[PDB]
């Protein structure tokens, strides 16, 4: 089996996770489930970025130690993934020693190679903007001992502390030719707009990779006064969870390099500039793709509690496109759950099964062929639906994949209206044509169910149970390659 490795970013537990975090984890889960269905040996990683000044600050506010606050927050994050039915194979926490030993050995290796050197970082910080400015780009400076931010117009404070600096500009030629060798590394194309003002050409200044002003993080083994900064600490999660530099590297050598790093748009530079340069410094292969989504603070728990899991999972992947910034409104939420799920899919299933009970006492007649004049094109549309779905799924166009699936679901409801099986049922001469129509209904529903398995966990399962499709062979993608899979009669369920 071919392998597939997909990661979410490790999330910062400075507060409760909102639907943006739910989007990212469900998106990665859909791709994980999708790839398992295609036959890949899938690993899906997610986790938490638990180091930094903010976490230390937040723990004292809880009236608790850092690890006890963190454990409490991580429990609720983990509980949310259980509720969302996320099929992640591991949960990496940066406070775990399996991570910290990797960050330590990585940092010490960069010291021994001469990649990092001791110095001091003197930067101007804005409390509002959360951005580091330089002496010359301050507005109305008062040699220079204060000033005002060019973005906010708010006064800045002198941030001055000891730091290790990473010489990243020497890997510039290798980075630029990696981009030339992988033109579509950043996906979708629009997320390359976050690469504007990269300063790879004019000169990447040495990157500050450790701080001295706080003690909550991975300590540098040869100079424990320093804590390793988020840049290297957080990014190492993708390789540390695989047991890189441990006594067992089997997961790493099986799953690295990563196929997709999934993320939100504001950390693309993180993953496309700093992360590959760090990997070159460690002489490791680079990730094949970064996939970045947009923005949408709503608690996902309320959405799952009130309307159910499928409703939440569907709405997130349907309404909020990956290549754009989606919008949460509760009006669109109720409409997506009522009109698409409950009506289009749900009435279809009820209509179809009700007629199979009414006319054949549950005995669904075997698929013979396209007997009705509308079947030839509908079967072709079924194959095209799978083909278009695939195109969208390979580009993480989840919104577009789901609408295509609903295109087919609407047409199936349309087919009932234009075949009018109740008219066929009256005439005994039309028994074969009625069974053909019933058969096409059920096969169309199966196509939709299989295609929806990555997105929804409950609904497709119950459709298979209602139609009495027990065979795991009838639930996989490969069974959608040729229409008309049920050539032997089936007993559908009596009371759905």
Swiss-Prot record:
A Gene Ontology term for the protein's cellular component: cytoplasm
Subcellular location: Cytoplasm
The protein's enzyme class: ligase
Reactions catalysed according to its record: tRNA(Met) + L-methionine + ATP = L-methionyl-tRNA(Met) + AMP + diphosphate
Single GO molecular function: ATP binding
Family: Belongs to the class-I aminoacyl-tRNA synthetase family. MetG type 2B subfamily.
Name of the protein in question: Methionine--tRNA ligase
Source organism (scientific name): Staphylococcus aureus (strain COL)
């Amino acid at each position: 089996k071919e392998t597939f490795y997909i990661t979410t970013p490790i999330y910062y537990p400075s507060g409760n996770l909102h639907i943006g975090h739910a989007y990212s984890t469900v998106a990665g889960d859909v791709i994980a489930r999708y790839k398992r269905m295609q036959g890949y040996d899938v690993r899906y990683l997610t986790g938490t970025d638990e180091h930094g000044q903010k976490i230390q600050e937040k723990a004292q506010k809880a009236g608790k130690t850092e690890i006890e606050y963190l454990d409490e927050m991580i429990a609720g994050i983990k509980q949310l993934w259980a509720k969302l039915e996320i099929s992640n194979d591991d949960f990496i926490r940066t406070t775990e020693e399996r991570h910290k030993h990797v960050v330590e050995q990585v940092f010490e290796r960069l010291l021994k190679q001469g990649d990092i050197y001791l110095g001091e970082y003197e930067g101007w910080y804005s409390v509002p903007d959360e951005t580091y400015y330089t002496e010359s780009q301050l507005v109305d400076p008062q040699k220079i001992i204060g000033g005002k931010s060019p973005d906010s117009g708010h006064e800045v404070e002198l941030v001055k502390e000891e730091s290790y600096f990473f010489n990243i500009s020497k890997y510039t030629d290798r980075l630029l030719e990696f981009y030339d060798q992988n033109p579509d590394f950043i996906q979708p194309p629009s997320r390359k707009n976050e690469m504007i003002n990269n300063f790879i050409k004019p000169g990447l200044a040495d990157l500050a990779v450790s701080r001295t002003s706080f003690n909550w993080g991975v300590h540098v083994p040869s100079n424990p006064k320093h804590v390793v900064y988020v840049w290297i600490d957080a990014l190492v999660n993708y390789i540390s969870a695989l047991g890189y530099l441990s006594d067992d590297e089997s997961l790493f050598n099986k799953y690295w390099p990563a196929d997709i790093h999934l993320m939100a748009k504001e950390i693309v530079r993180f993953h496309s500039i700093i992360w590959p340069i760090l990997l070159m410094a460690l002489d490791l292969p680079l990730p094949k793709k970064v996939f970045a989504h947009g923005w949408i603070v709503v608690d996902p728990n309320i959405l799952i509690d009130r309307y159910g899991l499928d409703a939440t999972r569907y709405y997130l992947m349907r309404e909020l496109p990956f290549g754009s910034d989606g919008v949460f409104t509760p009006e669109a939420f109720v409409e997506r759950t009522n009109f698409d799920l409950a009506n289009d899919l749900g009435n279809l299933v009820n209509r179809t099964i009700s007629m199979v009970n009414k006319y054949f006492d549950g005995e669904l007649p075997a698929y013979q062929g396209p007997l009705h004049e509308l079947d030839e094109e509908m079967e072709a549309m079924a194959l095209e639906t799978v083909k278009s779905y695939t195109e969208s799924m390979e580009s993480l166009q989840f919104s577009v994949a789901l609408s295509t699936v609903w295109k087919f679901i609407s047409r199936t409801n349309k087919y009932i209206d234009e075949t009018t099986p109740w008219v066929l049922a009256k005439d005994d001469s039309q028994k074969d044509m009625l069974g053909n129509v019933m058969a096409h209904l059920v096969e169309n529903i199966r196509y939709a169910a299989v295609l929806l398995r990555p997105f929804l966990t409950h609904a497709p399962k119950e459709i298979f149970e209602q139609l009495n499709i027990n065979n795991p062979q009838f639930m996989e993608f490969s069974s959608l390659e040729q229409y008309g899979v049920l050539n032997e009669s089936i007993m559908v369920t009596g009371q759905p």
